[PDB]
Design a protein around this ligand. Sequence first.
Ligand SMILES: *[C@H](C[C@@H](N)CCC(=O)O)c1c(COP(=O)(O)O)cnc(C)c1O
Ligand SMILES: *[C@H](C[C@@H](N)CCC(=O)O)c1c(COP(=O)(O)O)cnc(C)c1O
Lengths: 396, 396
Amino acid sequence: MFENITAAPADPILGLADLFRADERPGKINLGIGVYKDETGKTPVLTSVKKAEQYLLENETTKNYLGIDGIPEFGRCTQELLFGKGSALINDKRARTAQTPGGTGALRVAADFLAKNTSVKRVWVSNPSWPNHKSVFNSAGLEVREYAYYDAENHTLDFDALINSLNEAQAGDVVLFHGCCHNPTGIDPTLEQWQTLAQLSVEKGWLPLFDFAYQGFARGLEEDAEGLRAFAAMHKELIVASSYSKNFGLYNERVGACTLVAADSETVDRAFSQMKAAIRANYSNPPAHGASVVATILSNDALRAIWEQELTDMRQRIQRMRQLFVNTLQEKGANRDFSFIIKQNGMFSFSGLTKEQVLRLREEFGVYAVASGRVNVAGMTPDNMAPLCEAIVAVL
Amino acid sequence: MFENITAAPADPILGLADLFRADERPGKINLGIGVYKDETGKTPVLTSVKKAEQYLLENETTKNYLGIDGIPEFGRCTQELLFGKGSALINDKRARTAQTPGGTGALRVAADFLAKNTSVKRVWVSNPSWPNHKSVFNSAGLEVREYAYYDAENHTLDFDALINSLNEAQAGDVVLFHGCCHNPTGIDPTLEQWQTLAQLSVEKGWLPLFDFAYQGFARGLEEDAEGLRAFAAMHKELIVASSYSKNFGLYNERVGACTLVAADSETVDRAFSQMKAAIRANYSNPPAHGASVVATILSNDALRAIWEQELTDMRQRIQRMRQLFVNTLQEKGANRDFSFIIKQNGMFSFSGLTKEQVLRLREEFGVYAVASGRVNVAGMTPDNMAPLCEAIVAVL
Ligand SMILES: *[C@H](C[C@@H](N)CCC(=O)O)c1c(COP(=O)(O)O)cnc(C)c1O
Ligand SMILES: *[C@H](C[C@@H](N)CCC(=O)O)c1c(COP(=O)(O)O)cnc(C)c1O
C-alpha cells in the first residue's frame, strides 16, 4: 500500500534550520526563525506562564477530559480580547468559542466546519501569506485563491490592487484577513482601510475569516483588534481563528481558539453544534495545559498585569530592532530607503532583497532569511546588528 | 451562510452526564463514565505524572515548537512499548512515530494520510465499537463497514461470524483492530485467534490499523501487545494509533501516537513525509506537556516503576470490581450466569441487559449506563455494589 507514495516536498523550515546548524561560521545569523527571541537569542518561558504552571501543579486534582470546546473561562477571556468587554456580540450571545490546538487547529476546525456544513468552496488568501494557510484549507477540500496585497515597489499595502483582486470573489466565498501584524509583510490596513473593507465585504457577501495570531505585537491589545471589531460591527457572521502561541510564548502547548459568530444566539448555537462535531472527529477535545495557563493568567489581575508587561516588552524590543536595523543600514552605507521597516508591524517583514540576494547572504555571509524573503526582526540584536547590516550592504 | 445549518445530533455523552447531575436521588450511580475512577470515585492525577510535571516546571527553559512528529524520546519509548525492546521492526528502522493529540488525533492523522496518499476508500470496524471511530474515518472521506464481533447470546467473541463478515473485505481495505480491552465489550481475541487473523489479513491483503488505547489494562504491558506483535511479525505494513489518555490518566492533555510501519526504512521514511504533511495541515505540531510527561516517566527507571505500579493498581481494581459484581449479583438473587464479566478485559463491558432495562435502571433506580449498553466497571465500588446489584436484579 505504501510502496509507491510520492515524498512530500522537502521541509523548508526543517530545513533552513538544518543548514544553519551545520554552518561552522560565526557570526552566522538566523533571521529565518519562526518564533520570538529576546536580546540574548533565547525564547524563554514567560514568567507569568511559569507562575501559572506552578499554580496548576499545586491545584489540579484531575486530568479528566475537557468538553469539546474546552475550558469555559478560556472562551470568555478570548471573546473579551477579540470583541472588547461589554461588546454587543458578547451581550447578545452571538459568539461561541472552541479552544483548539493552536491557531492552526482553529483554522482547520473552521475549514472542516465550513466544508461539511456550508456551500463554501473557496477561500481567498493574501499574496503573500503564511504558506500553511493554503495547506490547511486545501486539506479540508477547499480551493484557495490569492488576492493582491503587497506592493513590492513601495513596500506598502497595494489597496487598489487588493480591492480589484477581490472583485472576482463571489458571494459566499470566504476571505481571509490577518487581524494585525500581517505575516510575512508586517503591512496592516489602516483603521479607515479596515472600515472600507468591512463595508465592501457586506456588500459582496463574503464570509470573513480572521487569522488573529499576533494580538498585542503591533500597537497594543485593544488597538490591534480595531480591524476585527470594525468587521464585527458590520457583519452578522464571521469566524476568528486566534492563537496564543506567540503572545504568551506558548508555541508548543498548542493554544488557540476558533470563534464562531452568527446573527443571534439560536443560530450560533445550532451552527456551533456542528463545529463541535468537526472537533470530535479530529482530536476529540483540546489539550488542557496551555489553555489553562492562558485562562489562569487572563482571569487574575496580578498575573494578567505581569503578562501584559511581558508582551509590551516583546512589542517594544521588536520595534527597537526595526529602528536600529534602519539606522545601522544607513550608517553602513546602504544608501537607499529602508524606512518602510519602521512602519511595518510585528516580527516579520520582507527586506526588499531578491531571492538571489538572500541566497548570497546565506552562502557568502552566513546570514539566513527565509528563501522567499521573510526576515524575523526578533533574530536581530544590538550585538549582531552591525555584521548583519554589513553583509546586507555587501549584496546590494 | 449559517442560517440553515442542521444541528448536530444531541450529544449523548454530555448528555447522560447532564441527566445524572440533575438527578436528586441518592444513591444514584454513574456507570456511563468514560474514564477510570478509583475506589473513592475520583480520577486523580497519577503520582508519577505529578512528579514528572514538577520536574518539567523546574527544568523547561522554552516552549519553542516541537517538530511535526513531536518529542523524539516519546517516539522511541512508544515503539518499545508497541513492539518490544530489540524488535526487528525497530532494529530495521521500519517504523516511524508521530506524537499526536490523543489516540483520536492519531486515528484522524492515519485516516487523512490514507485518504490523501493511498487507494484506501473503506475501513472495517467491529460491531460494536467506540462510536467515534465511524465519525473519524468518515470525516476523512472514508467509508466505514462493520464486521461481526459480539455474540449477544454467549457474551463472547463470535469468531466464525467475524471471519465470515471480513470475507467481504477487498484487498486494500483497512481493518480496524482493538489491541486489547475491546471497547465496549472487553472481549479480546486469544493469542491463537490473533495469529489466525494475522495470517488471514496477509492472505486477503488487508491493511491492519490497530487502535491501542488500553495497553496494561488487560493482563500487563507486554501481554497486552501480543496481538499487535503477532500482526507485526506477519505484515510489511500496518498503522498503530495508540493512546496514553487512559494508562497514564492524562486524558485532557491529549497524548497519543500514530506509528507507521512499512517494509523498509526508505519506504517508511517516504510515506512518513506525507503523514507529517497531513499533521502540518491539521494542528501543525503536537502539544508538549502531556507527551513530555510520558517521555519523562518512561525514560526514567524510578518514575517508570512508580507508573507501572499505578497502572497495575488500576488493572487490579478493575478486575476486583468485575469479580465483586458477579459475586454480588449472585448473592442478590440474579439467578443467571454473569461469569462472562470476569473473563472480559478492561473498564468496559456489555451487561447483557436490554435498552429498555437500561432505561428502567436510570428512571426508577438512578443507575446510569450508556443507553446502548456499555457499563464502566470502574464506576463500581465496594460501597455502591450492593445497591447497584439490587437495582439490576429488580429489572431482570
Ligand atoms: C504562526 C507562525 C509560525 N507557526 C511560524 C513557524 C511555522 O510556520 O511553523 C502563525 C499561525 C500558527 O499559529 P499556531 O502555532 O498557534 O498554530 C497561524 N497564522 C499565522 C498568520 C501565523 O503567523
Ligand atoms: C478512549 C475512550 C474515551 N474517549 C471515552 C470518552 C469519550 O468517548 O469521549 C478511546 C479512544 C480515544 O482516546 P483519546 O482520548 O486519547 O483520544 C480511542 N479509541 C478507543 C477504543 C477508546 O476507548
